[PDB]
């Protein structure tokens, strides 16, 4: 049976449907981190032109179909769609179709055969981000504490300047 080519063949296949894909910008590059699959993708902040993908008509259809189903299933009662879908070419050869959300409150892409490089990025970021947040609070608390002790040393010196001066002077 004969059928048209463009709507029958694709050069990209839908891999994963992420419900929560947080996008952040730091170091001059967007970082799409998914907490569900524990993966982090890096891009160049420039929307990869979908027209550049050879035989990629199935990608506007597949991406929009998943977005509509996911939005109505979970984000209809709490979030709102902002703009149209955005396609970004991530490091390693992964094309990410992104749909920003807000709270009510010609060539062929070569995909790498291992996503473990991205999983390590998420794991390191998931351990570095909090540990640094807790290293930052401890440092802040220590400084606030030291400034608090000065109120006691200013009075302890009068009681016995010999002992206070000895430990402070060295």
């Amino acid at each position: 049976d004969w059928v048209p080519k463009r709507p029958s063949v694709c050069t990209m296949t839908k891999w994963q449907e992420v419900d929560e894909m947080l996008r952040s910008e730091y170091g001059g590059s967007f970082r799409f981190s998914s907490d569900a699959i524990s993966t982090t993708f890096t891009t160049n902040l420039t929307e990869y032109p979908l027209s550049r993908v050879d035989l990629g008509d199935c990608i506007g259809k597949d991406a929009r179909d998943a977005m509509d189903r996911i939005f109505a299933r979970r984000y209809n009662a709490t979030h709102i769609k902002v703009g149209q879908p955005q396609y970004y070419l991530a490091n390693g050869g992964f094309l990410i179709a992104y749909q920003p959300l807000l709270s009510n409150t010609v060539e062929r892409i070569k995909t790498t055969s291992s996503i473990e490089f991205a999983r390590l990025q998420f794991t390191y970021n998931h351990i570095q981000r909090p540990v640094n947040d807790m290293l930052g609070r401890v440092a802040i608390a220590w400084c606030e504490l030291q400034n608090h002790e000065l109120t006691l040393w200013n009075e302890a010196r009068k009681l016995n300047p010999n002992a206070i001066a000895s430990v402070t002077v060295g």
Partner: antibody
Amino acid sequence: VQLVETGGGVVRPGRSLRLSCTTSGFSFSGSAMHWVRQAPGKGLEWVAVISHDGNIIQYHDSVKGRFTISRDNSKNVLLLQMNSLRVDDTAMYYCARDVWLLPATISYAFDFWGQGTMVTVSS
Amino acid sequence: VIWMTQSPPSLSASIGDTVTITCRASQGISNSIAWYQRRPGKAPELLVYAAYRLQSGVPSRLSGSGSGAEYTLTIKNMQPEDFATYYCQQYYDNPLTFGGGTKVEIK
């Protein structure tokens, strides 16, 4: 907020015309701009869009390849260079800013509209 | 191109009554749709976004609803300043298309 458009007038078919839209009251560099037309006694129709920084441009199938949208963030002025005009292009052109909901996304909706100017194609 | 069918093209209402304007698209657009208002002699002004988000400063008595390819805009208490042309525009896929428009007038 205030939006003003300049460059309208009567032009012969197949000729070029360039419109300009001045802005004030909002961060021009932080919001995308859109162009809308209103034919006499007809409905509204979108023309084109220019991102906040102008990196991406999108046009309507009825004006793709004929029009040319551009912006100058330094002078906070929007422009739409028109070429190869046709009789069907006779309409009131309005310049409108997108709805700011997120920092760099394009809402593809209109929140502020200008006074509009006429562009009549006659011979 | 996603055609936008808006009806009724024209209807009349009295001050202090309920009205409902229906807008239909040629294909399912989830919730990507906006509503506008254009008073005589003035430029249009946005009212609702994504079929449910009311714009800042818009009266709370005016609200929209619907899903898929069916959408509606309702006003529970008409005021003299509400009589104007209302347009429904979609942004699910390019090119952006507006509705036929419905002119609410005094009856």
